[PDB]
Amino acid sequence: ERPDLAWLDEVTMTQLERNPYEVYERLRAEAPLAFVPVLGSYVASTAEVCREVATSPDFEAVITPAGGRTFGHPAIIGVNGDIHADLRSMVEPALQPAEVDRWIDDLVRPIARRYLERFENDGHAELVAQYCEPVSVRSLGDLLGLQEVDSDKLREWFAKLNRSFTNAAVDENGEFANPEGFAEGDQAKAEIRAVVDPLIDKWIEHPDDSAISHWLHDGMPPGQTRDREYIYPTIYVYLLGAMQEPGHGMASTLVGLFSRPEQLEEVVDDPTLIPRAIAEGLRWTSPIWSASARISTKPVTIAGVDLPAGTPVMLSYGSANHDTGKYEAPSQYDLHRPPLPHLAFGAGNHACAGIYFANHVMRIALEELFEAIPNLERDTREGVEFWGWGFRGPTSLHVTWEV
Ligand code: HEM
Ligand SMILES: COc1ccccc1O
Predict the structure, then answer these.
(1) Which residues of 297-326 are buried (b: 16+ CB within 10 A; e: fewer)?
(2) Signal peptide span per the entry?
(3) Cβ atoms of 139 and 145 closer than 8 Å
(4) Which residue puts its alpha carbon closest to atom 31 of ligand 1?
(5) Which residues are annotated as a binding site?
(6) Which end of the chain is more exposed for a tag (fewer CB within 10 A), N or C?
(7) 221 CA to middle of ligand 1, Å?
(8) Candidate from 352, 356, 360 with most ligand 1 atoms within 8 A of CB, to mutate
(9) What sign does the dihedral 282-41-185-94 (CA atoms) show?
(10) Which atom of ligand 1 has the smallest separation from the CA of 358?
(11) Mind spelling out the 3-state secondary structure of 309-342?
């Protein structure tokens, strides 16, 4: 509809999945709020627009169309008002910093050592599948009460939910262009129900210290639990992004450090720099790149665009974190970048609830990795490809080291 942006009509879903950064560089210069036809939605590409939409009193949360098709109702990311307040009160106890500090080290550190012990003397590894993803899912899986779900299965589930959630391509009529792309999401959810329904059955009668047991019981009148249909969409929110993103974040941080070998040596020599390295890694390739959204609740003007009430806006935080209004040469990883606010955890009432936990999982994992393999080198015989528009990270990270 907007004549000067007619080139957007030719942007494809595959191009956004393989490398969204070229199109979004144009968006940030040309139209910080722009309707992208293949996504069927306005997209916010700059830091100022993302932060304004995420915190505006005239916007509320909405799930993207493919996200809603995947999660249903009431996903914590997609609801507001009393339901959102309840779901936030449900998830927040185990994520409170003082609580996380009581047990996070005893949780993640033995998990990291267990996965490292399987390959640390091989001289070669593919760190995404052998380390980053397993540590991420095994840590959260144990916290949740899914100790008996193998890390292979948790990784499979978040990959299928990822592809379903981000199956966003639409045709000229706004209809999903890839309707068969939700089937593996439905298949994953069916498997999850078969595993988790008996656990919920048991937790209702015998509560324990698992997070999902507390989701059922916390804050309820005596003898009542939250209905499982009411909590399952937030279980799915966890089984996608909460399982996937810490692994994405540590892997992207490592890829960034490899691209600056002198900074990798700095961080290995001084592991107190690991949190700073992770924060730059999240800015450099944001794990949640363009997954979440808001919807206007009244007519509003954003970036010169007069939006009617009921207008969805996708928050492309991964693009906002390359805003050259904030950063110099943002496409380069730089451990010594002047620390600034970033949007990798979002903003507003629907900002990430698990920031403190996630940073600790990533930090401890990198601590243990650099301790066990101080001479880690990237396998330059292999290249690192990143994939994903909604959620983005490296598909593999081949490394070598002298044994
Ligand atoms: C590096 C890892 C992670 C990153 C980069 C990340 C980032 C994000 C982002 C961008 C959002 C959407 C915010 C918005 O729309 O403004 C979000 C939401 C959320 N995240 Fe995180 N996340 C990570 C890990 C986790 C973990 C491990 C958990 C749970 C233990 C978690 C729990 C949540 C929840 C519950 C929400 C929904 C909040 C709401 O809608 O009220 N996240 N996260
Ligand atoms: C924390 O997990 C999510 C965040 C935003 C969208 C989907 C998710 O599963």
Answers:
(1) eeebebbebebeeebbbbbbbbbbbbbeeb
(2) none
(3) no
(4) 354
(5) 84, 88, 237, 241, 294, 317, 347, 350, 352
(6) N
(7) 29
(8) 352
(9) positive
(10) 27
(11) CCCEEEECHHHHCCCCCCCCCCCCCCCCCCCCCC
Q: Decide: residue 177, CB within 10 A, 0-12 exposed, 13-18 middle, 19+ buried.
A: middle
By CB neighbour count within 10 A (0-12 exposed, 13-18 middle, 19+ buried), where does 64 fall? buried
Backbone angles phi, psi at 399, to 5 degrees: -135, 160
Q: CA 323, 329, 330 angle in degrees (round to 5)?
A: 45
Give the DSSP H or E segment for 230.
helix 228-237
Resolution, Å (one decimal): 1.6
| CA angle, 41 then 42 then 44, to 5° | 135
3-state secondary structure of 223: coil
Strand-strand pairing, 41-44 and 312-315: parallel
**Annotated binding site for heme: which residue ranges?**
84, 88, 294, 317, 347, 350, 352
Distances (CA, A) of 379 to 249, 259, 371, 395, 399: 19, 12, 19, 14, 4
Ligand 1, atom 39, lies closest to the CA of 350
Which residue's alpha carbon is nearest to atom 4 within ligand 2?
Answer: 241
A 10 A CB-CB count for 139 gives 26
Q: Is 252 helix (H, G, I), strand (E, B) or coil?
A: helix
Of the candidates 2, 60, 51, the one whose C-alpha atom is nearest the C-alpha of residue 31 is 2
| CA 251 to ligand 2 centroid distance, Å | 18
Structure determined by: X-ray
Listed in sequence order, the residues at least 6 apart from 107 whose beta carbon sits closer than 8 Å to its beta carbon are 139, 142, 143
Q: Residue 288 and residue 392: Cα distance in Å, rounded?
A: 6
| Single-letter amino acid code for the residue at 229 | E
Residue type, 228: R
